[PDB]
Swiss-Prot record, chains A, B:
Pathway listed: Pyrimidine metabolism; UMP biosynthesis via de novo pathway; UMP from orotate: step 2/2
Broad class of enzyme this protein falls into: lyase
Gene Ontology molecular functions: orotidine-5'-phosphate decarboxylase activity
Sequence similarity: Belongs to the OMP decarboxylase family. Type 1 subfamily.
Keyword annotations of the record: Decarboxylase, Lyase, Pyrimidine biosynthesis
Record's keyword annotation contains Lyase: yes
Upper taxonomic lineage: Archaea, Methanobacteriati, Methanobacteriota, Methanomada group, Methanobacteria
Species of origin: Methanothermobacter thermautotrophicus (strain ATCC 29096 / DSM 1053 / JCM 10044 / NBRC 100330 / Delta H)
Name of the molecule in the record: Orotidine 5'-phosphate decarboxylase
Subunit structure: Homodimer.
Domain of life: Archaea
């Protein structure tokens, strides 16, 4: 009850960098998805004012995938600017340590918003430093009372290890490895290209939600 | 000759978040400083168009302190958007691994710009994961032909270790933490509040440059 409800357990990764395209696609799928993740490529290209535009046009929740990774004072300012622009939640790296995460939690508490802790990634290169730190980063989050987590699904069983550390109550989102395996552990899956590059995004979203069931 | 020349070895960390203040202060010090570092608090608050404004008003070099820390494809897009906006260089985390760094190097090569690898940080919390990875991150940079590095100066002797790994030819910038011994290892020092919160920023900059001797 204390974590967000994501409609149909499906989050749109809106990774297009053009405002017209981003708004067009998002409008086509709003019947199916109430939660949209946007990142720096779009906001740097079009301005942070685009966040309020998504919310005012569509009434969707916005998660700012900004992978915040600075010192505490700077993290605080990034979070404040992002929440002031209307973001409901922000994604934060754990690798820079507990004080950097707490800075974000502080601003979220002040402003009534949410922090997601990114515990692990699974692109090539993640094996160098990230994967060996993942379990400790997750435990750091739990020890700090973090309730929302982002984890990779390339290895669904790792998603299980994460779920093991954070408990069943925490909110966990992940890209949608096989969605069937992923949804055993994640509360919602994140879907990008298969929807936003589709000839018919509405139909794509509708089909994804059916399979989720 | 193949790395940048920073006028007076002094980089302004322009961490103010409103455009009027940022432009006022930068204008006061441009006689002394030709290189300005801008981060997310300012650009998210005022728009990426502010980068071109600094360059057109002041003819300064801009380093975008964006601590890029995503997967390769997203890193590529962040770098492209940032360079398109006019940034001369971008600061990139090494913790996400070699492919994520190479994505940035690829765009920089294409566009004729520069990547700075952030090897280490020294805020509280950096001891958890960052400090133990620092030497390996620096070696990863060297192995990838990275020429520009950012390192912390809270422990000047750590700057010596970094300088040891990257060689004498690489370009190294660091905050200025006694400037005296930081400059034994770093090619330029980064100064923020001492200048931008000063009643007389011009005098503050002038004094700093004199101290650098």
């Amino acid at each position: 009850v204390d974590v967000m409800d994501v409609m149909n357990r499906l989050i749109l990764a809106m990774d297009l960098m053009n405002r017209d395209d981003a708004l067009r696609v998002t409008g086509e799928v709003r019947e199916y998805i109430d939660t949209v993740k946007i990142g720096y490529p779009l906001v740097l290209s079009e301005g942070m004012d685009i966040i309020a535009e998504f919310r005012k046009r569509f009434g969707c929740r916005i998660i700012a995938d900004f992978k915040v990774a600075d010192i505490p004072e700077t993290n605080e300012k990034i979070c404040r600017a992002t929440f002031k622009a209307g973001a409901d939640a922000i994604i934060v790296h754990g690798f820079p340590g507990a004080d950097s995460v707490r800075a974000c939690l502080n601003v979220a508490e002040e402003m009534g918003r949410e922090v997601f802790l990114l515990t692990e990634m699974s692109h090539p290169g993640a094996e160098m430093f990230i994967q060996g730190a993942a379990d400790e980063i997750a435990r750091m989050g739990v020890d700090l009372g973090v309730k929302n987590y982002v984890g990779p699904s390339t290895r669904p069983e790792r998603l299980s290890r994460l779920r093991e550390i954070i408990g069943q109550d925490s909110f966990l989102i992940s890209p949608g490895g096989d969605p069937g395996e992923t949804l055993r552990f994640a509360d919602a899956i994140i879907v990008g290209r298969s929807i936003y590059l589709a000839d018919n995004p509405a139909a794509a979203a509708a089909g994804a939600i059916e399979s989720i069931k």
